[PDB]
Amino acid sequence: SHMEDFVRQCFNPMIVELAEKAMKEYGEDPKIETNKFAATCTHLEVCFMYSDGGSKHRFEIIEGRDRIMAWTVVNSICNTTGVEKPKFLPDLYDYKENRFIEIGVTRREVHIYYLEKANKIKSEKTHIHIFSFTGEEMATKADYTLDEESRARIKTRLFTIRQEMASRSLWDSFRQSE
Ligand SMILES: [Mn+2]
Ligand SMILES: [Mn+2]
Q1: How many helices (H) and strands (E) are present in the chain, helices listed first?
Q2: Is there a catalytic annotation at residue 91?
Q3: How far is the C-alpha of 60 from the C-alpha of 45, rounded, in Å?
Q4: Distance (Å, rounded) from C-alpha 13 to C-alpha 146?
Q5: Distances (CA, A) of 119 to 21, 66, 111, 114, 168
Q6: How many structural domains comprise the chain?
Q7: Rounded to the nearest 5°, which phi and psi values hold at 171?
Q8: How far is the CA of 73 from the centre of ligand 2 (A)?
Q9: What's the rounded Cα separation, in Å, for the pair 160 and 172?
């Protein structure tokens, strides 16, 4: 599929392999679920750019691990810090702020996805940070965790991915499929 080749020429190879394992872990095939394939890679890259901002030992990366191992770290973070165990696996834990973070990448309005992410968690303490494919962003308590320059990089990369999909005529199917 054309989407499949774009995702392979767009994201770095380890991001692609890490997405595949995340897909195969839930039965989804990147070769037919190609739109979900571009979404998992985009979400994976944002989480790794996000942890790249801040101090060296600031973030414990929960995403990209396998479910049992990912929970193993979450239970480890909880008993270490006393923070409540979330109902769903988050993406990162902020050692600087002592809270889990849920990263979200949207193709609709950032205000709708966060509203969609907020009622699902109900965990209150879990921080939520949302980015769009157009440059906006929305975070719990208006606390954006990272500095403006690190968030500007993520927004820049998202719009580049958005442009490259459109120049290849795959953006409309990607947008109209979320
Ligand atoms: Mn996740
Ligand atoms: Mn997420």
Answers
A1: 7, 5
A2: yes
A3: 15
A4: 26
A5: 28, 25, 13, 9, 36
A6: 1
A7: -75, -35
A8: 16
A9: 15
Dig out the tokens for 113 from the structure. 């996805």
Identify the three-state secondary structure at position 150: helix
Chain centroid to Cα 90, Å, comes to 9
The structure tokens 């770290």 sit at 73
For residue 169, what are the contacts with CB-CB under 8 A and spacing of at least 6? Answer: none
| Ligand 2 centroid – CA 32 distance (Å) | 22
Task: Say whether 63 is catalytic.
Answer: yes
Laid out side by side, the sheet with 127-132 consists of: 59-61, 92-94, 99-106, 127-132, 137-139
AA identity, residue 98:
N
Residue span of the structural domain in which 126 resides? 1-178
What separation in angstroms does the CA of 122 have from each of 80, 82, 117, 119? 22, 18, 9, 6
> In whole angstroms, what is the distance from residue 119 CA to residue 116 CA?
6
To what resolution in angstroms was this structure determined? 2.7
Nearest to 44 by CA among 71, 10, 72: 10
CA angle 70, 34, 65 (to 5 degrees): 10
